[PDB]
Design a protein around this nucleic acid. Structure first.
Lengths: 205, 125, 114, 132, 58
RNA sequence: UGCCGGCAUGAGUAACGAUAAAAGAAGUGAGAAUCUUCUUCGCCGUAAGGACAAGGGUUCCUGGGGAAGGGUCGUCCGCCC
RNA sequence: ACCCUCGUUAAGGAACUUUGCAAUCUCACCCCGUAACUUCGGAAGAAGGGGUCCCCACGCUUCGCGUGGGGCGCAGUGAA
RNA sequence: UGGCACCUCGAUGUCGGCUCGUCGCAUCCUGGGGCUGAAGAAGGUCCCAAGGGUUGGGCUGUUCGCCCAUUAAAGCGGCACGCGAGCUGGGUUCAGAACGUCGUGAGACAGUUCGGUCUCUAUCCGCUACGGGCGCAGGAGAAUUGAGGGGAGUUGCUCCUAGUACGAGAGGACCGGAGUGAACGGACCGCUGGUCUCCCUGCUGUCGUACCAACGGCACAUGCAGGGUAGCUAUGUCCGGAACGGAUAACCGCUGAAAGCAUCUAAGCGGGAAGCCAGCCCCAAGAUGAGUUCUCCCACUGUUCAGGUAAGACUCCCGGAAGACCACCGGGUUAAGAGGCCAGGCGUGCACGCAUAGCAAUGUGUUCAGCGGACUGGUGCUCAUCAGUCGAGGUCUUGACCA
């Protein structure tokens, strides 16, 4: 129920007396800015707001959202959820110790409506002769004339998935001197310079 | 989202070297009569010193370094790019004015053992 | 799919055999006219090579010589091209539009000086 | 790992031509004979069992001719890295004679062996192990 | 070799609601830096030939 | 489920032909990317050379104009005079 | 996306599958070297082994090879 | 396997094989349960619902089938015994020939065998996608809680109270535990590799420089041997189905009625693994069942008629590891966005001049740098003067409410 911040860059890092795997992420602290109550606006809530911009010549409407007891420029927004926490910044180095099983999430990868051969990874169908089919197609996917509405399945081409992947469990590395760093171990989603909401232990006991 | 107008890479290159503390050896010098040796594991400790009798060769790129460019012969070949970045290994050795083949990796040869493959690389055929 | 930049549409042997009878119309002329991409990835060649043109050596006249089959490419790069702008790193000729082909859509600039 | 698979010197029993093809396992180091075990994979590990194809034979001392029997293996050449920012791997390996029940007939291995066969319930592995 | 022929057609009714999901983007946005009025999507005259400074030619 | 004559729609998509590179200065003028005076490139050259055999009969020229054709079109044709 | 076309692989080399058509692999010249069968003229121009570029004491040298000291590259009719 | 011959001969082509497979359960392997002539190990039959899942070789055209080892086990009825708007024909079942008996001969056989073309411009219903818009009533950049549409689950194995309850002897649990694996969701580049069609070295043949160290055009759009970044994906690495509440079936009760005893008396309530509410994500309050917040323009008048004045969307210039277009992003100068130049790796590994041994092929030296397609960057130079489009102030009624 804590931090949230921009992906971008990974690498392999030392562990005990070896090298292992590792992953990395960058961050800052957009700061709350808004804080209401429980009377409309539903449950608890909050709204993240801030990173690295020049919102001046941006527009003259968002600049006013930016108004409470803080300054500087903001880039993105977003929210978190219910819970209790001070009114400071985003960072895994807040009040809750170090060494936590955070659970990141990612968007997508720069693709564009491709085959189910990818949506299924297996495109079986030997066709080393005839080439009417270049193996890329599943085939079959049909029956007789008793009705037929293509079901709602069929992961045919379309638009892939900037959607949330919620990586779950992904251990932390080390916390060093600096204005917050934060790293992990295990791919981590979000294409390169992602963002990631970052979320508390959800695994079901 | 992690791209705006800020250069944060002193973690990727700072915190990166915030843990290092070593001037490796950095000698690609082939065919040495003795060298470094892993601390092993096995029992409780019994930190022995007889991993592999290397010829020393190679470099790499950052925390990875496919060290081994050695293998042997009793077991046909057998390389296993070990991690240059570690604090559990003997602090190397270096010897040999070295007639240097290509340095770094090779992959070729490595089977052309026979005999004349001591510490040279030119040949007439 | 890929990205980054720097690609190739026109032939795959047109990367060391093209401007050598295309952008060669710049030594004695300069009325060069070739694509709204070629030129944009042509800068990494023209204003590019010049550091070994500042004076005059030999090796500084190799693929500076034979790379643009001509004479002015060397008999001018030394004391008339490099020094022509031997005070500003990159950024000189004002390549832009010109008036398109009328039919399809491809402009090709001109390149000049003064 | 893999059906056929061409290798080099085996148990040094006899001949320089061997085989393997079928895989068997149960996660033990020398139990006995039961109904089942495991091996829904597509290869092996290292200090496994693997119903290896006999194919050849040894001179004449305690090993038969056409023979046939659930042979074993030594090392492989697929996956796993030595953790120490490195790896340990061949592109051949050997076999060695190791009883169907799981009683490693280990006469006298010659040539380098493995160090990763010290978590594979080595027992009769690494003893007469030449190079390590 | 012929794959299921035309048979059914699509004259009127349809063939109407097909000039709207494209059409032409409709423009008339800008009208040149200073003099007269051309400009394109960020691009200098041929009139005075300029976005703000020296370029092109009458 | 006829026959011709015309309008059709498949629809503006598939396709411009063996995937055997081309840029440009300049002539012209109605604007010119594929003409023309031309330095650079490359494909064939036991060929996709030139002559004889059959054929088409008007190809070749002094050149000339787009109605139409060369499945873009064009101030090029061996279209048409 | 996919699609015809081309090339390069860790891990096994046909377990793939009706059967290595396809795919793709692969088969220099000189010398020495060479079977069961056989109407001995064959089956093999088989298998296999060394070289063939360069400075040189040197041929029928207006052109080959050759007893030798040696030169470049990981490899030498080396592309086809 | 069929009895019917009802429309299908203006014609719907066996079977099988890969892959897509998604349904049902009677359940093929878990689960909690009835019993077991079951001590344990392990089963023998039955009860309940889907939560999942179910191999590789041999032959065949194979449905089937048995032979080899596995597998927690290898299902049964789906679908014209799934389907060429996939291929395949492979058998055989199109015309050729051969055998077996036969018809007198021409010839006959779901008797046997050898080869033996195979479709076809996808308007579309529909489905996987992205856009043109319309929208619950002033116009807008964006941040949001939600029905719900999908994704959404399988399992052997060490060690431990385990050498115990049980067993007169071999051996070995109801609970869970950290632990090794599979086809199987993604991710990520920085452990492993390829890919690289132009950056280099190596070599034969041809030409252009007269000519040479030295280079280029041709050998798939790199000729041949090798190397290669930014990217991609698997063998690369990590994570994947386990807490727990309502309430099940199999089953176990507290009081035990009516037939004064008892049984889970359906009259009070509990224990019940997997489904179903839920717990991880997309979508999405336009689900017309119109939800909330940060934010911008206006105190005037003329074509039941009526203006001189906009900020947000945008043509866009140079660009994005974003792509057909395009929803998301970076500069338009109050200027560091692609390229050139520059510090540095990068790979061809010691470029060119010159002197020398001297027949000299070549070598040494100055140079582990010369040489370097998109690399952390820097330089605001090659480009950025400017210019345009919704030119506007909350519909009817009644209530909590304002002096």
């Amino acid at each position: 129920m804590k931090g949230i911040l921009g992906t971008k860059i990974g690498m392999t890092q030392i562990w005990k007396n070896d090298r292992a795997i590792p992953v990395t992420v960058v961050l800052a602290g957009p700061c709350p800015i808004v804080q209401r109550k429980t009377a409309q606006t539903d449950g608890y809530e909050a709204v993240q707001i801030g990173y690295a911009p020049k919102a001046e010549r941006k527009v003259n409407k968002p600049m006013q959202g930016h108004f409470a007891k803080a300054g500087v420029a903001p880039t993105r927004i977003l929210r978190e959820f219910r819970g209790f926490a001070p009114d400071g910044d985003s960072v895994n180095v807040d009040i809750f110790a170090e060494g936590e099983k955070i659970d990141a999430t990612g968007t997508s990868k720069g693709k564009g409506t491709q085959g189910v051969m990818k949506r299924w990874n297996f495109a079986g169908g030997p066709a080393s002769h005839g080439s009417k089919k270049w193996h890329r197609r599943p085939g079959s996917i049909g029956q007789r004339k008793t009705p037929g509405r293509v079901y709602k399945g069929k992961r045919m081409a379309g638009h892939m998935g900037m959607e949330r992947v919620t990586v779950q469990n992904l251990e932390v590395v080390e916390i060093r001197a600096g204005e917050n760093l934060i790293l992990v171990k295990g791919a981590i989603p979000g294409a390169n310079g992602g963002l990631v909401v970052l979320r508390s232990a959800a695994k079901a006991s | 989202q992690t791209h705006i107008k800020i250069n944060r890479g002193e973690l990727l290159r700072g915190i990166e070297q915030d843990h290092t503390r070593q001037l490796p050896d950095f000698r690609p010098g082939d065919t040495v009569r003795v060298d470094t040796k892993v601390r092993e594991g096995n029992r409780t400790r019994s930190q022995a010193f007889e991993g592999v009798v290397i010829a020393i060769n190679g470099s790499g790129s950052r925390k990875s370094f496919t060290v081994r460019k050695i293998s042997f012969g009793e077991g046909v070949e057998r390389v296993f790019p070990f991690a240059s970045p570690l604090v559990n290994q003997v602090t190397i050795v270096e010897r040999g004015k070295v007639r240097r083949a290509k340095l770094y990796y090779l992959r070729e040869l490595r089977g052309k053992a026979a005999r004349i493959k001591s510490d040279r690389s030119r040949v007439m055929k | 799919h890929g990205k980054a930049g720097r690609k190739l549409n026109r032939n795959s042997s047109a990367r060391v055999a093209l401007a050598r009878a295309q952008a060669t119309a710049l030594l004695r002329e300069g009325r060069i006219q070739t694509t709204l991409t070629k030129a944009k990835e042509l800068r990494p060649f023209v204003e590019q090579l010049i550091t070994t043109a500042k004076g005059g050596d030999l090796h500084s006249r190799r693929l500076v010589a034979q790379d643009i089959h001509d004479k002015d490419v060397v008999r001018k790069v030394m004391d008339e091209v490099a020094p022509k702008y031997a005070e500003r790193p990159g950024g000189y000729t004002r390549i832009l539009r010109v008036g398109t082909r009328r039919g399809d859509g491809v402009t090709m600039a001109l390149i000049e000086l003064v | 790992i893999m059906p056929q698979s061409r290798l080099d010197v085996a148990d040094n029993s006899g001949a320089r031509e061997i085989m393997c093809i079928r895989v068997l396992n149960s996660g033990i180091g020398g139990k006995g004979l039961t109904t089942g075990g495991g091996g829904n994979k597509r290869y092996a590990h290292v200090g496994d069992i693997i119903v290896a194809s006999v194919k050849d034979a040894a001179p004449r001392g305690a090993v038969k001719a056409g023979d046939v029997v659930k042979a074993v293996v030594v090392r492989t050449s697929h996956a796993i890295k030595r953790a120490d920012g490195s790896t340990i791997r061949f592109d051949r390996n050997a076999a060695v004679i190791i009883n169907n029940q799981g009683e490693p007939r280990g006469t006298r291995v010659f040539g380098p062996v493995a160090r990763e066969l010290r978590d594979r319930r080595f027992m009769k592995i690494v003893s007469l192990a030449p190079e390590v | 070799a012929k794959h299921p022929v035309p048979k059914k057609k699509t004259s009127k009714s349809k063939r109407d609601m097909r000039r709207s999901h494209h059409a032409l983007t409709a423009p008339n946005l800008t009208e040149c830096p200073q003099c007269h009025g051309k400009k394109l999507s960020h691009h200098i005259c041929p009139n005075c030939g300029y976005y703000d400074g020296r370029q092109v030619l009458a």
